[PDB]
């Protein structure tokens, strides 16, 4: 989106190598690079937002519903591993 | 994995003890097994969270996590070691000093930097077991298979380092704006004196204390371990003083009444009840079963409160007595409280109309001894607390009351109810580290009440020199209130006493009519009261000792501030105002544990326990607030303890199995004397909740009944808008085939009432319920994480619905209620730990107005413990009967059916999903519009503001 | 299974239509799923939940008819209500009171009978007396259990030892010939029972901590050698008994002396199951009664001995 | 006290003290010294030899172990804690009648272990302490 990237070495030291051996020195595709530090749970319905909002009226319409007529991790306490963290 | 099945090497506590020192034995050994066993399950969480892993090049660990109770500790060492004390074989003291980089987290500094004298913290080293390319930890594996805790080491904590190595004291924290530079910070320690000792004496040379990496700091409820357990170490050393009439229903031996006002000779006849009655009409309903009268030369007309009753039963003669053919007698005098102000003073004054046992209680509360009142949910156990106090209070005013409780949210509540009373605001203190965040309005923390004190004194002075104005004396009389007292002694005193002489001297019968207003010299003073003297030297006389009392009570008021002239340090402005100003002293049972060899060194005196929640305190954290002051004989000097809880409502949360359900540490105090049938009056008139909401719990309780008003109040006799009936239980079928689900040991989990909640909830907002006055609970921890992971999603991401008020574990919510409770049962194979009828009667007790369990009713039907709850909602459907077309609030009376239409009933989760969708959807306009309206006028009202 | 027959014969959603009482289904239900099962926790707990105690073995207990079976199964589902430990235990018979005399007098009687029950039985009971001696605010249960620890079972002591008790408190020596005479004067026929029980339960539990010497896995004339570890969980259930008897005063009273004279830590100490690693919550419990066994306290008034006190009074001791 | 400033308290301290001290008042006075000794501690030495002649051996101990505790390289009347200790020692162990609130025991046995130039001697004051006690079982077992 922005024109930036950014990259996390395993240590410092290779970072501290990456900086200083790469500092503003030209890559071809960049020209010259600047360096610097730094599911749907099923059979549910999902209520849709209305638009730009991000009580009731005293008389509802009551729609005419009418009855019909593995599961795995949906949720984050579900996930027996999260649960330690 | 205790399940009850074997034998175990444990202490127990049953009802009775051998003597003192076994009960307090017990307590340490099993107080110190299970407060190890919650260090260990704290220390286990947090390095999970911290993620430590061996650094691949390398020897040492580094953390790729974090958490909230701990930091990485960039270094530490031990700076002294002082030798042994005279007699005493461990070092006298053995400081560390840790630095910690406290990270970039504004929410997080403000706990650390807040680490204050006596928090405990672990100095924690460890290790990875696991060298692997990216590392996780799961909770299913065993702890000791993933990370090596090579030691632990507890300290106690002294204060934050400042810029250059000084302590910085508990006041700093409101004047240290002035910020310490940078994320570096220091904290000095205090180390273990005995494991220091044996960590040296066994020889070492791989010493210990370099190799710490974390500090692990615990929460605020349970630092008070060590503070715990050094206190029954020390009552163990020396003579436990418990009070001669109070050690044997501890111990359980005697007549359980032997601390009962009925059989304490120093029970008194006669009590001013005060403000408790609020009409000679209520004095005569408040005893049943007694005769009462006016004493001679008042009518019935004209008696007013306050009151004084003499029940004729407690006084030792024969000539008054439960003689033959007449009743009990109270005999009452309506009290002329001499007013000591001119102004149109208005008393805050009691405005309950408490029920008989509230006043069997409160009369309980003012005779000496061990008072116990059972406090059914809803039924006003706060009022009588604070009528207990302020009667205290102003039947004898130079003794002080110690008020303990649970949790500080009650702590609050009192607060709020005593200054509705006729309570002085410098006579309050409040003690806690809640005290950063108190939400009354007015601060009563040590730092609150001396800055009101100082605030006071300079109001007060400029009185004085208003007096002294009026008197045409010269000179500065209020630089200080030193000063003030010279001046009143010397002058005020002086011209009253010379027009108290001109009065009487004179007398009627030589003054002239209205010659009072005239020779009154303080008229000057009161120059805003208008007609302040009639002109009838009888009333203006009367009037006259008004205005000398006002004035009297500022200097009175003075006298008792120059304290804080000559204490300047703000520490000892403090400890002033603990040991000799403030009266009511409010502290939680876990500060109070913490504070006693502080309390004990400032030679802090109280007269009076009151506890409220009594039955949620621990046995040992219920015993330690006995012994706050030292006896100052052979014998303490406690007058009153007054325990108010309900031991049918959830005992204290022990959680190791063993200690909770083998040595019984899950019983509190509270539960222990009522077990030993100490007299304890029961509150029997429910207010809070709608009679047939009540109905489901009462049956416990004997002979709990509803307040008038509760039949009588419109919210009460109204339907619960949009449901055909006030509560039900509805039975939640499989949801995806799955009934609960279970994604650890004894973690237990329902999607399918999780779901079901989250449509009726949004069923409810879609009908116009404010989100405030819903609030899901359900009996398990799991399934509590999933209902606010499932609200998470689909409820606030649209503002349209909103969080509800508060989702919550049932025992979170002990003493909480609100209007409308979804509560999911969430056990569908066999029933859980809510067989225990107080999970139950917790449970259902929480609605005001609706409750709609969610669960499987097969499973929770045929219970017996359950029956007499079941038996009510199996009177109504298992499948929940809504009435889409009334939207909240409805005129419909609770009992009647609706004719605006049909009812339709929800089969299932399924069911109520897909319905809730196409309400929503297609009311969603409507509902729309009354937010845009709503969000608009919100904003603009305040927008001039 | 539990649920079929419960739902036939007991449950109460089906009061309108359950069978009228068998008594023999008790016998079935308990050598089926209980005995025969080495008392299965899940079956147990199906039982006690299904409200089996309250609507079928205790109502329908007449003393004449109960077997074994019958006594057993009733201390089988207390014993499940008192490890579920939330619950009122002793509520139906705190309700239908009158048999219960004669209940809990017959479970005594189970427990000195030493042919005929399995060692898992036995565990049972004694594990019931733990539970009965606990529960000392239940009135019903305490107007027994009192009755095994009260003046009479001093009988037992050595002639010197029970002299020594009257100097300590002369008082008492008044009260004893009252005893002595009353005791042999009128109710001998209940009376010895009840002031023998306990010394005849300490040597029931000997036999039983005998039983586990190494020299008894010498085959037996049947063939079989008993496997220790029901026998040690009666041991280990011993040991607490002892202790929940030591820990309260008003059984400490006549209890202690009853203790020492019995030489039960001795028998306990010197057994080969102390030094076994089969034993070793034994041991654990043995000196947790040890430490009662001589706890800072005299028991006749009650009174706390300091440790100044207790300190001097050896001294004193040793030099007499 | 109250009404003057702190800086001149020692003007009234020493005529509060030498008032005090010029009779038999030893329950008010130890109330007062006490007090004192929080804005002069220098004075605590000239406390221990009021309270001795007093014969409040309990407190005289107490206020010595306070001394002892205060492990100052030199004192204000020139004794130094080795000094000072001896004397909590001559003072403790020739008075056990009277020295109540003090664990006797635990001090001489932890001078042993300290001052070993004198073992054989606190050995006998610590046996002499229980001979004078007349608990001669205790003093045959030191």
Known sequence: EKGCAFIEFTTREAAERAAERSFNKTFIKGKRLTIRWGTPVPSVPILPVPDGLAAAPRSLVVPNVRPVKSSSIYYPSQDPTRLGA | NYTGDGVLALDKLNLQFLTLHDYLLRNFNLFQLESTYEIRQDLEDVLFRMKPFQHESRNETVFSGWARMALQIDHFQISEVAKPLVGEKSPAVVRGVVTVNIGRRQDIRQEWENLRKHDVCFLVACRSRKSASGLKFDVRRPFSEQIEVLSVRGCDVEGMLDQDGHLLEEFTAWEKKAKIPGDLRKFRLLLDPNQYRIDMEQGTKDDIYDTFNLIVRRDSKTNNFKAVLQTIRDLLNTECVVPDWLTDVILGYGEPDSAHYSKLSSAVPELDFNDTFLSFAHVKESFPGYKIELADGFDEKEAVPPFKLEFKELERRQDVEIKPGELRTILVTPLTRKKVTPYSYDPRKNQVKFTPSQVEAIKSGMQPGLTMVVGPPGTGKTDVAVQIISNIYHNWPNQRTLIVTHSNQALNQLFEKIIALDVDERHLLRMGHGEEALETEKDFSRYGRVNYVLKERLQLLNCVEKLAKALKIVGDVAYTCENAGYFFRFSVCRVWEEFLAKVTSKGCNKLAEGIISEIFPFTGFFKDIPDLFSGNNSADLKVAHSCWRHIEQIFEKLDEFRAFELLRNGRDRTEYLLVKEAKIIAMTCTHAALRRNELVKLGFRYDNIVMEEAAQILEVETFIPLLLQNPQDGHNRLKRWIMIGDHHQLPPVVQNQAFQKYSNMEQSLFARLVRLSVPNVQLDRQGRARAQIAELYQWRYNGLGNLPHVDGLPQFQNANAGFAFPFQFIDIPDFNGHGETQPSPHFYQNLGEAEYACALYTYMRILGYPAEKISILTTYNGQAQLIRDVFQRRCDTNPLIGMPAKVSTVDKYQGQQNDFIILSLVKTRNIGHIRDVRRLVVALSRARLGLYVLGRSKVFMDCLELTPAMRIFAKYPRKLVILPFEAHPTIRKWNERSKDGEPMEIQDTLHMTHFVHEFYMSNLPAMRDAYEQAMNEYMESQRLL | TISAVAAKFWAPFTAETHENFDAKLIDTIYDNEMLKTSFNSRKIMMLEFSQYLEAYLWPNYVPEKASKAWNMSIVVMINEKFRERNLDSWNCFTKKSEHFPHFFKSILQLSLQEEGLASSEHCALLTFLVNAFGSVETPIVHKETRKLVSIEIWAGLLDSQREDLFKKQKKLKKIWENVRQKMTAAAADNNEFERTYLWNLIEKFKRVLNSLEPNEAQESEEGEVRDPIDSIKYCERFIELLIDLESILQTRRFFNSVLHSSHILTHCLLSSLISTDAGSLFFQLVQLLKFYARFEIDDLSGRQLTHKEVSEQHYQSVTR | ?142
Not at chain 4, 24 to 45: C, F, G, Q, S
Not at chain 4, 50 to 55: A, G, N, S, V
């Open chain 4, 1 to 142: 006290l109250r009404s003057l400033p702190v800086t001149q308290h020692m003007r009234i301290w020493t005529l509060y003290i030498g008032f005090l001290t010029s009779h038999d008042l030893p329950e008010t006075t130890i109330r007062v010294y006490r007090r004192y000794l929080k804005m002069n501690p220098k004075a605590r030495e000239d406390y221990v030899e009021y309270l001795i002649e007093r014969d409040q051996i309990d407190e005289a101990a107490k206020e010595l172990t306070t001394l002892v505790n205060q492990d100052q390289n030199v004192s204000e009347k020139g004794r130094t804690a080795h000094q000072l200790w001896t004397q909590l020692c001559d003072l403790i162990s020739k008075n056990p009648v009277k020295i109540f609130s003090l664990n006797v025991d635990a001090i001489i046995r932890q001078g042993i272990y300290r001052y070993t130039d004198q073992v054989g001697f606190l050995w006998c004051s610590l046996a002499d302490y229980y001979i004078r006690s007349a608990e001669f079982e205790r003093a045959r077992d030191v």
